[PDB]
Amino acid sequence: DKITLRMSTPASETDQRSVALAEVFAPAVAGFATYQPHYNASLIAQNSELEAIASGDLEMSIASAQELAQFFPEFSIFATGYVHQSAEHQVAVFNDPLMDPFKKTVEDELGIKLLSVMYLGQRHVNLRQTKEELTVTTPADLAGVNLRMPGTDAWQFLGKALGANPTPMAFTEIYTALQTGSVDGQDNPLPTVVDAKFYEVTNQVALTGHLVDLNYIAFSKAVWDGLSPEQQEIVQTAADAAAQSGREKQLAKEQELVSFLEEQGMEIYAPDLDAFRTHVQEQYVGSEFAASWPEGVLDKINALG
Template sequence: MKIKLTTILGAVAALALSAAAAQAQTALKWAHVYETSEPFHTESVWAAEEIGKRTNGRYKIDVFPASQLGKEADINQGLKLGTVDIIISGSSFAARDYKPIGVTYFPYIFRGPEHLIAYTKSDVFKRLAAGYEEKSGNHIAAVSYYGTRQTTSNKPIAKCSDMQGLKIRVPDVPAYLAMPRACGANTTPIAFAEVYLALQNGTVEAQENPLTTIEAKKFFEVQKNIILTGHIVDHLNTVVSKQLWSSLSDEDKKIFSDVMLEAAEKTTKIIADKEKALVASFKERGLSVTDIDKADFEKNVVEKVKFEDFGYEKSDWEAIRAIKE
């Protein structure tokens, strides 16, 4: 009887411990708008699993790719509503809460990916990220290189004036509109998930995105001219909601930050390496890939676009331009 009672009590205790462990686990949602084949997704999945491991299973993070939880504006709003806990999103959306952080989208501010990464380690970035956190409560834990934005079009483009009257899809973000509008294009904001169809049916004649996105979204199937305008060296932030970040212990904050930074570094390397190979790949597929005179485009932007129109500080632009790789 004693042995049987001990066995029963042991089983009850084990069940109680198991129930307590299950109850202690926190379920989190990590959302983004990118395809499952892209490193923004694969490295997010790795990070979600790694955080689970390093916290001994106290956090279970599910990653929702390809706009499953909404478009980019929706998931940014979701941070405030509590419907998502972590997102990957551009500073253009962070700028809706804190305009100065969007200065990184001013055309030709960065010389290339190395300059961008140097910026993310600078005092300028720390100050702008702190400004965003103060306004929104959300915490930027890491930054990934997204790619250098290039243009695809139904027609060849060699100089800024060639874009006059061109119907081009551009995200509904003020700084993204700067270069096309400075060149006289007609900009149209179309949701990211709908761009392929818009290009296919002629709703727009052009779009702009990094080469990796042009490949992942298969825009090259419906656009035969790739113009290396290189107007924006783009990035994505890994953003943790105010509610989640404030609930984490200092130890867990370090774990989340360390893992997210590691994932961002891996993403950056994958993107940079792939971009280098894609120009040759697109040419092999029979596409026209054209270099342009960036000085002509930059001159038009500087002459026709004002920092004040976007809520940016010229001093921030100057400080970022001065950063050495």
Template sequence: MKKLIMTFSLLLVLSIVTACSGGSSSTDGEAKGKDSITLKLAHTGSDSHQYQIGAKEFADLVEQKSEGTMKVEVHGNSTLGNEAEAIEQVMDGTIEMTVVAADSSLANTVPEMNLFGLPYVFEDREHVYSKLDGESGAKLLGLLDDKNMKGLGFWEVGFRHLTNNKKEVNVPSDLKGMKIRVQPAPVWEAHMKALGANATPVSFSELYSALDQGLVDGQENPLASIYSMKFYEVQNYISLTGHNYTPAVVIMSNKAWNGLNEEQQKVVEEAVAEAATYQRDFLTKQDEEIISELQEKGVVFTEPDRAAFKEATIDVKKALENQVPSDLIEEMSAK
């Protein structure tokens, strides 16, 4: 009988030890889970848009650099809202990150970003990158600090070109009376007015439909956007004006940023910078391929008189006198 009791007691002790061991394993798993972080990044582009190209590379780099302890969920196609809504959500900490055009809705929060709505500030990509990746770009990103956001860097949207479904555009007068979709910022209205066109604000996510239904005659965007959003399906003419360069600003909420430790912050910063290099190289090569493919599809390309466009829009900067300091414009345009 005593032997039976001892056996039972031994089994009971073993079961308790096993249970405790199982509890420890669960706790370790929970602790590991707490150390892992998932960041949501929202954007409005399609699955092949410039935003997505940068975001996917960024997500891959974050996971690699953090050895799997950090992940990025990319939510494109405006699934979490348009750019204005995404910015609001980042500001209040609802989502951790977004990437948006500098001179679109972001300019309503940080007026100095309207700088990128000014025509012919930059001559070429090398000129752009020297400014964005230097002290000038750092100053602009720093302006987001007071808006409860952290500016992490600049990816690329690209040099912008005009498209329409009516006729070839070679000089500014060819645009007279056309309804051209613009971003929701005053500088774009001034820009189109200077060219004799009627500025018509339309959300980027609704632009294809607006072009298809004839609500607007044309729009202006980089070749990569025209291609990825399939605007060429409803636009017959592309005029390579190269009138503006639009950077994509990568933003994180201060709440999310401050919730990272120094090592995690370093991972994010390095991944943003490396994704920028990758995306820029990818898009530079893609431009020539897009022109060739769209010409085969019947799209008509024109090389406009850029000097005439530059002259016609020289006074657009007056629309920004109360928003963008003149010395900032001079600093960014100087080579």
């Protein structure tokens, strides 16, 4: 009997992360495990997947530092505006010994292994307003903008730190919120802007680049522990191979889609990034998030970039 591996994500079927797991991870483990993905948060709500793995109702998810920070506030360090520099930097950080205690905490306290880090992409402010209606140059320009952000404290804080007035909303609700004007904008990376067709209901992207964002491939520790050494090696290899494939494809999308978006009439332009970075840094000073970061870890992350 093969082990069933149920995976739940709010991501679509066509998202590069989903594709990588389905086309690279799934066939590699198929000899002993059957991958069973659920997209669009049909099975488990966004931000409830970790709990579902811990409670034996799910085996895998595409988790985030923000989701983990709900349980272990120190994970907020990996979800902090302007800290990660690139996809390559994320990999260096995840593989550095600094990550060891973070990984151990999740295993010991949630019964979940973080197998791999995946690249999600550069988050930017995507607004319904045209550039002429609202030009984003400094954080002051986002005053009073109702910016959707995902529903966790660290996510809301990031939206606030940009200068906007964040509102929490599940990923699957964004399109309709933009269509009806219940929010002014959202911040998913360009491949998602296209995949989810947010460009049909917005007019600009201000390239704030405020979070070079990532996910983790989360995997039940109970399942892992029941696998043979050979099977564990295959699962780890399959997860890393999927992350690597997805990363390359996501980066390619990120490069090519600017022109596609502009062809759809989107205005895509950079603000004053020095001004944004400086402002966001000072927003974190004095915050609960800053106080949760273990000694020396931020400096270590910086040095790896």
